[PDB]
Amino acid sequence: EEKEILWNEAKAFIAACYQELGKAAEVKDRLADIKSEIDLTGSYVHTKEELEHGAKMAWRNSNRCIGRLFWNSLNVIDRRDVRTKEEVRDALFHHIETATNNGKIRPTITIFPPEEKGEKQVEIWNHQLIRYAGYESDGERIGDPASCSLTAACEELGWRGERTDFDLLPLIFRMKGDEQPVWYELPRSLVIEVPITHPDIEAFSDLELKWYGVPIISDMKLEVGGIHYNAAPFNGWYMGTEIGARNLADEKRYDKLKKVASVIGIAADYNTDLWKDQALVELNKAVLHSYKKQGVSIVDHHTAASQFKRFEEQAEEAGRKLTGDWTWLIPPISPAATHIFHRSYDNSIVKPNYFYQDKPYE
Ligand code: HEM
Numbered sequence: 033e034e035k036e037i038l039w040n041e042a043k044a045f046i047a048a049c050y051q052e053l054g055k056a057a058e059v060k061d062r063l064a065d066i067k068s069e070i071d072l073t074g075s076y077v078h079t080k081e082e083l084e085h086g087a088k089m090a091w092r093n094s095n096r097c098i099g100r101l102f103w104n105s106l107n108v109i110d111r112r113d114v115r116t117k118e119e120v121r122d123a124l125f126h127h128i129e130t131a132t133n134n135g136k137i138r139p140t141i142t143i144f145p146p147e148e149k150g151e152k153q154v155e156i157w158n159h160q161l162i163r164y165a166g167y168e169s170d171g172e173r174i175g176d177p178a179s180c181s182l183t184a185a186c187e188e189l190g191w192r193g194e195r196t197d198f199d200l201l202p203l204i205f206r207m208k209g210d211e212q213p214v215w216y217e218l219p220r221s222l223v224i225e226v227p228i229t230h231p232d233i234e235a236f237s238d239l240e241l242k243w244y245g246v247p248i249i250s251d252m253k254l255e256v257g258g259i260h261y262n263a264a265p266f267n268g269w270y271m272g273t274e275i276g277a278r279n280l281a282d283e284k285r286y287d288k289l290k291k292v293a294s295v296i297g298i299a300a301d302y303n304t305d306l307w308k309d310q311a312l313v314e315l316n317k318a319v320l321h322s323y324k325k326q327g328v329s330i331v332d333h334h335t336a337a338s339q340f341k342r343f344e345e346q347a348e349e350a351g352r353k354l355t356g357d358w359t360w361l362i363p364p365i366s367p368a369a370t371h372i373f374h375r376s377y378d379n380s381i382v383k384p385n386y387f388y389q390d391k392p393y394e
């Protein structure tokens with residue numbers, strides 16, 4: 033039980049990790065040191081090299097991610113030494129600052145202590161480290177509907193949002209042995225935000241839309257050789273459609289297409305006018321324009337798919353199977369204008385990888 037699965041994943045991982053690092057000779061002894069450690073202790077501890085390359089492999093294996101060309105330049109921050117809430121908080125603050133990098137975003141992951149055996153050492157409640165709160169009372173909706181349950185969790189613990197449409201949620205996480213999480217307001221100085229303007233349509237600013245600079249996904253588990261890093265927030269830069277075609281456009285999110293139609297001067301009355309499609313394009317142009325104007329990293333979906341084609345080519349050249357989720361790789365805007373749409377992808381799950389895990393709240 034347990035201890036044998038771990039040993040199994042350890043061999044598979046160390047073998048492949050050391051091959052890729054050109055250290056195949058050291059596999060026998062390292063598996064023989066892991067040998068004993070799992071016997072005596074029930075677990076084993078990755079070297080800094082194994083953990084860094086493991087997190088990079090996990091990104092490379094993420095079937096749904098179009099951005100995987102850059103998997104090998106991931107900036108991995110080893111924070112397995114953290115023991116206190118102040119240290120977790122400061123490491124999360126640090127992640128924001130160094131990932132943001134004044135707008136020239138650095139793909140970064142901060143890795144906290146892995147679970148003991150099932151027991152989390154640190155449990156992060158945020159979905160992303162920077163995200164907007166969401167409210168619904170009396171049928172007035174404010175903010176980001178996808179954040180309603182966490183926002184309400186946060187307000188149970190004594191936080192109170194100003195109830196703008198763009199309240200920054202606090203960092204919220206629980207330590208092993210604490211019954212409740214703590215929360216910390218984000219220092220505003222750390223959070224870049226981009227007002228959404230349009231290159232051509234001066235009135236687009238009347239919408240008073242903004243989005244934050246850096247998506248830092250903080251609720252996924254990193255699995256590396258049987259070790260379960262449930263707390264390992266990571267970030268890339270945005271692909272513009274995530275903001276323009278989903279966050280700001282979806283009916284169950286900010287639902288802005290009808291307001292976009294009005295400010296760009298087209299009627300939103302007939303499906304055959306394709307006003308939603310037109311508003312989608314103009315909003316997505318505005319998002320790319322705005323991030324570029326402010327000097328915040330962003331990629332459009334055409335360039336992203338172009339990079340992903342190079343990832344595919346690199347995989348074949350390296351003899352690695354390519355895996356991918358066609359339904360998530362195609363962009364939600366003009367998908368058939370990318371090569372992705374016109375091919376198929378094996379959706380097999382390879383480890384190391386990032387995985388969903390149950391929310392600690394409800
Ligand atoms: C460098 C810029 C990056 C871009 C532009 C990018 C782009 C994306 C996009 C567009 C998605 C689809 C999500 C959606 O449509 O809502 C995605 C999924 C994903 N990306 Fe990336 N990504 C990047 C970096 C990273 C990094 C650094 C990691 C981890 C180290 C990562 C891991 C993933 C994972 C795990 C998913 C799937 C999440 C899920 O199932 O919900 N990505 N990526």
Ligand SMILES: Nc1cccc(CCCNCc2cccc(OCc3ccc4ccc(N)nc4c3)c2)n1
Pocket residue numbers: 247249267268269270271274278359360
């Ligand atoms: N029914 C379907 C079918 C097909 C595709 C979809 C797309 C889901 C998008 N629905 C918004 C959303 C929900 C949950 C998680 C999300 O984020 C994942 C993620 C992870 C890492 C990223 C790294 C960089 C970056 N730029 N983005 C990332 C996004 C998004 N739904």
Ligand SMILES: [Cl-]
Pocket residue numbers: 247274279
């Ligand atoms: Cl997002």
